Amino acid sequence: MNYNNKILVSESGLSQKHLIHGDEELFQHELKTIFARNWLFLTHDSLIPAPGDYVTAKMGIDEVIVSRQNDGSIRAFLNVCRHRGKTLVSVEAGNAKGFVCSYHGWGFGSNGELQSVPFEKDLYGESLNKKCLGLKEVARVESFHGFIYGCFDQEAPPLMDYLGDAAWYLEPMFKHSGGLELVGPPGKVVIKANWKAPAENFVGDAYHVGWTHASSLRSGESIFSSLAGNAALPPEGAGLQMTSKYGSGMGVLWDGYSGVHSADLVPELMAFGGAKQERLNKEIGDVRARIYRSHLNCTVFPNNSMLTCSGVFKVWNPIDANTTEVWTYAIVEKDMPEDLKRRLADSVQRTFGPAGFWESDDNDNMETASQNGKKYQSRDSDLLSNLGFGEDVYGDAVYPGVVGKSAIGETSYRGFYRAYQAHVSSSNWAEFEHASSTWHTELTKT
Amino acid sequence: MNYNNKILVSESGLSQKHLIHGDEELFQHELKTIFARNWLFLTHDSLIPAPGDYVTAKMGIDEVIVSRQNDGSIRAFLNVCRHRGKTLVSVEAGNAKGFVCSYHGWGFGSNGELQSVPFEKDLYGESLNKKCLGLKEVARVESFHGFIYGCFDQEAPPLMDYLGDAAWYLEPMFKHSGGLELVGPPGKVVIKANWKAPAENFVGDAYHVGWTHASSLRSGESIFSSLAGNAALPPEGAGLQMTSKYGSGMGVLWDGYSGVHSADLVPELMAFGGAKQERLNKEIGDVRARIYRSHLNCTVFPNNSMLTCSGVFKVWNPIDANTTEVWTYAIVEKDMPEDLKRRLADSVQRTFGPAGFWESDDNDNMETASQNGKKYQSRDSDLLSNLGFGEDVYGDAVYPGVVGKSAIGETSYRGFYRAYQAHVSSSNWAEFEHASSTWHTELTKT
Amino acid sequence: MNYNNKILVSESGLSQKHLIHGDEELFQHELKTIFARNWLFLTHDSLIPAPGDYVTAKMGIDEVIVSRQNDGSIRAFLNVCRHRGKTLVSVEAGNAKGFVCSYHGWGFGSNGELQSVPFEKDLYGESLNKKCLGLKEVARVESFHGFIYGCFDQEAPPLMDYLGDAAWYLEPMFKHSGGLELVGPPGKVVIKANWKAPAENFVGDAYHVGWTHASSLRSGESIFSSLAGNAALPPEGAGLQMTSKYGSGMGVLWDGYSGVHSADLVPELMAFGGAKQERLNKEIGDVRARIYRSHLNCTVFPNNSMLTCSGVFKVWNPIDANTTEVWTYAIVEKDMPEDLKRRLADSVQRTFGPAGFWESDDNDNMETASQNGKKYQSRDSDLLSNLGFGEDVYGDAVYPGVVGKSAIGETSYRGFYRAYQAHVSSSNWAEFEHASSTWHTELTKT
Amino acid sequence: INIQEDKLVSAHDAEEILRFFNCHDSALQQEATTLLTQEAHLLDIQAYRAWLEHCVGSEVQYQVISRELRAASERRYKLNEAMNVYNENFQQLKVRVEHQLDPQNWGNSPKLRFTRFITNVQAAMDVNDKELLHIRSNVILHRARRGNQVDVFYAAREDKWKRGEGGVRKLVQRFVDYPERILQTHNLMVFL
Amino acid sequence: INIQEDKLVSAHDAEEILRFFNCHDSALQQEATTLLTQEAHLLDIQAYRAWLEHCVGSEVQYQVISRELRAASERRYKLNEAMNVYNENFQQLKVRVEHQLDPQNWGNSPKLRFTRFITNVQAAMDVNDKELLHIRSNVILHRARRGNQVDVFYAAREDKWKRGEGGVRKLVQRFVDYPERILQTHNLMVFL
Amino acid sequence: INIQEDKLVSAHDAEEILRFFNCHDSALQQEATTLLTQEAHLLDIQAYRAWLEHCVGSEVQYQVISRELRAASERRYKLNEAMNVYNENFQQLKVRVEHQLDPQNWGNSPKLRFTRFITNVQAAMDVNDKELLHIRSNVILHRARRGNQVDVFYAAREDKWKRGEGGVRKLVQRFVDYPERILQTHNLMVFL
Ligand SMILES: c1ccc2c(c1)CCC2
Ligand SMILES: c1ccc2c(c1)CCC2
Ligand SMILES: c1ccc2c(c1)CCC2
Ligand code: FES
Ligand code: FES
Ligand code: FES
Ligand SMILES: [Fe+3]
Numbered sequence A, B, C: 001m002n003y004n005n006k007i008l009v010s011e012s013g014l015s016q017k018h019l020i021h022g023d024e025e026l027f028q029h030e031l032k033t034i035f036a037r038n039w040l041f042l043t044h045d046s047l048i049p050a051p052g053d054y055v056t057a058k059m060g061i062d063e064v065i066v067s068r069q070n071d072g073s074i075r076a077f078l079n080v081c082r083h084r085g086k087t088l089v090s091v092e093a094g095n096a097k098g099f100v101c102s103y104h105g106w107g108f109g110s111n112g113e114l115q116s117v118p119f120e121k122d123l124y125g126e127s128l129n130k131k132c133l134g135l136k137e138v139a140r141v142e143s144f145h146g147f148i149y150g151c152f153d154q155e156a157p158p159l160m161d162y163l164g165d166a167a168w169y170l171e172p173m174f175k176h177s178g179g180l181e182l183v184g185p186p187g188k189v190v191i192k193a194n195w196k197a198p199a200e201n202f203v204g205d206a207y208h209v210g211w212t213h214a215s216s217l218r219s220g221e222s223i224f225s226s227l228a229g230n231a232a233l234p235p236e237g238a239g240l241q242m243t244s245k246y247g248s249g250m251g252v253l254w255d256g257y258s259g260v261h262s263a264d265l266v267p268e269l270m271a272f273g274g275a276k277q278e279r280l281n282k283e284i285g286d287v288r289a290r291i292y293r294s295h296l297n298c299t300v301f302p303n304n305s306m307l308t309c310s311g312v313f314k315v316w317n318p319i320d321a322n323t324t325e326v327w328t329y330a331i332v333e334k335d336m337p338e339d340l341k342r343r344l345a346d347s348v349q350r351t352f353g354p355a356g357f358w359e360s361d362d363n364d365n366m367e368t369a370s371q372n373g374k375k376y377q378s379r380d381s382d383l384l385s386n387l388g389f390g391e392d393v394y395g396d397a398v399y400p401g402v403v404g405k406s407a408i409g410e411t412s413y414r415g416f417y418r419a420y421q422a423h424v425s426s427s428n429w430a431e432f433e434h435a436s437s438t439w440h441t442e443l444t445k446t
Numbered sequence D, E, F: 001i002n003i004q005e006d007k008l009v010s011a012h013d014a015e016e017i018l019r020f021f022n023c024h025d026s027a028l029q030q031e032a033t034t035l036l037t038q039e040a041h042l043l044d045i046q047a048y049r050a051w052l053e054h055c056v057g058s059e060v061q062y063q064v065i066s067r068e069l070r071a072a073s074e075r076r077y078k079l080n081e082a083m084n085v086y087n088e089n090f091q092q093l094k095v096r097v098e099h100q101l102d103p104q105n106w107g108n109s110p111k112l113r114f115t116r117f118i119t120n121v122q123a124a125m126d127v128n129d130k131e132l133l134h135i136r137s138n139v140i141l142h143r144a145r146r147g148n149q150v151d152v153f154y155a156a157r158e159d160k161w162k163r164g165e166g167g168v169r170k171l172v173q174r175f176v177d178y179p180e181r182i183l184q185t186h187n188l189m190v191f192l
């Protein structure tokens, strides 16, 4: 397939070829043009707070060691020994000043440097240039309010610019709330879906909630529960959708601070969020204080998703075109009482974890939509994302980005896939920029 | 591999490259040139007799919904939602006026039309063109005496013409017997064989029976039991072999109406078949009345096989080059007493079902012959099908098609593979026809 | 990938691209340029000593039947029927005058000839040319002191020449000891490693022993036990490394006759080996008598390895780039007391068999180093084998081959990979020879 | 069980539950365990004739079904719900046993390896037939052959056992509703 | 067990061992076996309401954890060692039960098939609470759906059971430390 | 069993059957079940020293074989039919135990997870040695490590147990004929 020419995503992001969810050659191409090029979620400050603390993380199909340095910074390195290529670290988290390979015993520092080689004097003499044998380092590692992302491409935009218009929406919860913590360890489960299936669902799919999650809505009594079985359409002004230049996007459901949490947490959460909102009114204004306590379903392009307020935090780690390893963390606000943090974390896993009953509702949807992309008569078929097209705006006086002023639509699918196609057909960041110089105009046509 | 030029099947169908049973690139090519082009078995009238009745079926690796319309016709559609591509129907059979997608709730009619979209007015307004969003329909659906076949290629010959000379042999049992019913549900088992391995076996392999099935013949006491361990060659005139332009073929074993059925059913069946034969003598003539009560091992090209009289009905559903999902139904004559139909159906499954002891005899044969096609030293080796070559005739005054007037030979392998090669090397039906304009001459050489 | 041009192994064998352990296209290319071209281990005289005795063996991914002929010779044939390609023999060993196919009953002799076809007269008449239908024969089958190797390429050098300089080191144990026997049946286990990972480890990796096998060394009390946890570097003169033109190589650890055997066998073995050494001094000289009772870790290129004295004998049978089927036999000296042979065989399996506690130490090393070769950021990375480079010699007055006069180094990696690259980039033996005309000069640079 | 409330429960399953929740007899559960463990041992070593002689009653119905996947809400489509993978009387079992033992059963060389794991044994005497013993048990059946073929079967078995010749308790009915619709084990050629 | 000598043994596991090695009561082991076999039967037929009514105590804690993989020698890193796949009180179990029974739970059509294998049952009364019964057992749980989806779960269960309404012994705590870190079963949506 | 009639049955298997079909003692079957359940618990928590101390006799032979695949009709080829995956005396088991417990056994970090399922327990006293207890049982052994590595082993175990120090019944012989010829579990580094 010629990725320079092949139209995988049609103009304005209105449709995508179903093969994108099943084609292994394209998956291999995505490793280069999506995963090696873009910002990928690694960890949070709260998981590696002290010098020597480390975790392992996936970046695409690669595995990295992410380590807190003595100077307070974070560096990340391929989890691969520079000698004969053995995996260096076999655990998920810990604290160490270095990592010793179990094959021939080479010792690497937390800073990636080759520090020791067994019997170096007798074996290598002075001939081994250890200075050139440090672990392969992730070029770019940056933080968004404690959330640490990595990028293999030195040419990438800074993480803040990469978030583009999405950053404005995230800031009330990520910054102005006093800060978030990530509660680990994550749940980890393999699903038989393409990584794009849950990514697209979290970025912009409010339409599915009432039908897909009818049973969870009915059974759990959460605040979005009037949606069960499509019994009721949210009123006008119930929310909006947004998307951005580099592909990140989200839905906003106004005031939904208790999110998917069952009735047992609703009164406590609605009180806590409302109280903080009243304080934030004076600092960031009414609209942004309201966004703080509004439910955001967001994907940070390409494969990190979240539900703020619900507190669900996801990495869709790619394995192959029909296999994804799902990591699920909980996010909590630092200034929440500890007992509330504990119950919130359990509730995130209860609803969206390995045995998350909400998440279970999505399984067949994600898996079959992905697997059908391999089927002969469906490969060249068109997946539709035209809902709300021709009603999006850009440059609004109040809400930034390409914005659909309605709670349910496909605005964020269109921006996600526009960015995806621009990357797949480009050889580097400069070409992506050239392919994106009229991004918002393309999305707001008709 | 260049399929226009590569000789996968030699002249006159005398041999085939062993790679055809193992090569995944060729399997992918077969999806286009075999499965998307030819007639494939879907269901029987008896399984969807009433308006709204439906079943799911495979066509190649694609899945379809096959539905009885209000007007009495049958239509078939891809089991894939036109929105984001989720699998629409998750059951194997039922009755419904339509199908609702569990993802976003789109509702399709039994006629494939997009009938409803949740909150269409509020969300899409008048902008969604539902008329263009019907399920992807199988272009051609036709019946052969209640047996329903589908074809994705609008250019295919009518099903009756496609059956070619094989139809004459099938008609006494399929038409003149008063009609057959298919007894469901089918057994379903995955085997590690190429679909062509059982297809070729059923189309033309009487040679294997005495040796492969020695234990089943000895243990069951069926009427073909003198064959056990190659203890006895069938007499001259015991049967014949035939093949046809579009690849379908069969063996005929004269008078073998009780087929593989154990001694417990032999007297009842031989009486029933003989009695109907006496009636049919006056209607269709002695020869065709005899064919009615003669055992036919047939493959309807490419991947539907059967043993008439034994009542075994098979679909070899392709998964990959070394994986096939075997569906096994029973066929019975409509005017048989109900208790006999019941016992016949159980006996079909007893012998050739998921725990069919006869079918089990074939497992290693099919699986290893297929898997060896991947092995380096065997890929370019020649599978032989030359038995009886130079003794076949065409245009016989009594028996139509390319015919070998002997019970055991490889006539039907040659015609199956001649048609296979003509399809693999052709881009459409017109090219197949051009490649087949001397089909019978090629088969009757020397 | 263009194998004529791609530098997979750098000059002097100093490094290899990590992709060589994970790339499936290269694995398929190796079937042609490595496995179909080179000498592969089949069996030992001691396993098929009598006329009619046979075993099955893998050669690459192909399976062969290896049979003792009436005239005392051994012939090997593809385990594939010449009719419709079924696997002929389903057992691992036995005694027979021939092999009958379970599909249609064709009977082949132990000499590969098609001897009988059921009902040949009635079915084929005189038309079947059985003379041309013998099993596909392995072109070359030769013995090295009872150890039987096969090669599909008629153009290969004789086995003795192929062993090159390695033969001199093997001869004291393989020939001058009075001869070895192979004790079967082998252990068989699948590991998720590339075949090259254990091959390279056995050919030249003494560096890993003290660290990888720290626990086995500490727990078993074997004679190499001072190495545990890199507690002690072997003294200077403790051993050497060698490699050869056609890729075979080994390490020599002086005097280590009890090898990996736990303390329970040490006194018995050290007495037996020392006693034979004293006799051999007078026949083959002190140095070669010493080599006899010295521990050799050897790979006979490409995928047969051994530890002499320890008595471990390995075949790394390739399945795909990250899957290898490990066969483990024991070698014993024929003139050892039978009870010692029995205990030695059990000890080989105890240490290096399916539940070999030493072999278990290597699992993660082999598996992860192999699997990392598929990971995007590691494919183009360089595996290092530069230890001892610039200190190797050729044409030494005492020790032949390219030799590193030190116990621990990567000399044998360099020669293994030099030969590997020469084969991968060559279309036949003549091209390999041309690519190898300065083999030792390349290895001894700097 | 109230199946109007417990919406997922079939009438058949509810009936079978009631059978065991009532009179619990520990001695019967132990007898049943021995009976099934001995049966499994005979099968595992492929003593098929011994299994017929010692474990199988002359009036046996040995049945394993495969049920078509239908909608939970389906109420109109009325055609055959299941097929019989097995539905054997004693003579039909004997045919299968002879097929296994035949020296020209090529698939049985090299010899197969069977290992059965029987758990969750429950036993209750029939209310109406004081000589009819209901036994329920679950089986994991492991079949290994030809170096690297491995097939694992999982099932619940609803049995009736009755004293026959010599007072020996023998199987008079086995019913299995096989839980996997599409078999991934090459075939179901094992005695569950 | 001396965990200074038996280096691989956790203090928790050593404590749990001691509980059963002491007073062995055969009758209790039999009662425990019946209790667990009946529980498994109710779950297998998807009688989730019946399971709650008959098997689950009002004060239940139903907990399944997934423990982060850490170095055997780790002693500095002190952050949350595990997450809760399940950590349910009775009302939370009831929510999950209603979710299973809801007619718009699309994933439950066609009906799922469950088969549970319960083994290695051990039982001991609590030393301090004479009405608290400790039961340990292992489970293999087989879930089949949609033709060719098959998921097999394996776990050890540390239970406490206590007599509740009507003198019926009911589950008041279940603890499972799930042995596979990354699930290969699509989800853990089964009651272990 | 008549092995001339039951053609698929080995003389060894026929001998082992006879041992249990004879004197059935329910109490012995219960003792055997407890013994094996406690052994499995010690192994599952990796209390290998405790297993040696409490479960393994000083005169033990601990043996697991892998038998070469041969023709069912083979009668001429007479060479070694099997190899020993395990064939350990007490000291050799101790070596393996020390290897497991060594802090430089890199493969044991992060800690492995074991779950054993023991079923089909049969027990009979030896006819000639009144202190020798024959126990037969089947095992499913689940080993999980490193996030997504999962290996499941299946076997039948022929044991002899005898009272040793302190009157404690201990294993003096275990024999397993491993049913899969080519292991698909990376290794057989588990105590069956
Ligand atoms: C609101 C509530 C839940 C979810 C969304 C929006 C998208 C993913 C799941
Ligand atoms: C007669 C009887 C049985 C069979 C054939 C012919 C071909 C397939 C199986
Ligand atoms: C000495 C001793 C053991 C081994 C080597 C050398 C290389 C492979 C294992
Ligand atoms: S592979 Fe890491 S030290 Fe050699
Ligand atoms: S995928 Fe079917 S309604 Fe959206
Ligand atoms: S395939 Fe061997 S005789 Fe036909
Ligand atoms: Fe959802």
Ligand SMILES: [Fe+3]
Residues within 6 Å of the ligand: B201, B208, B209, B212, B213, B358, B361, B362
């Ligand atoms: Fe057949």
Ligand SMILES: [Fe+3]
Residues within 6 Å of the ligand: C201, C208, C209, C212, C213, C358, C361, C362
């Ligand atoms: Fe090693």
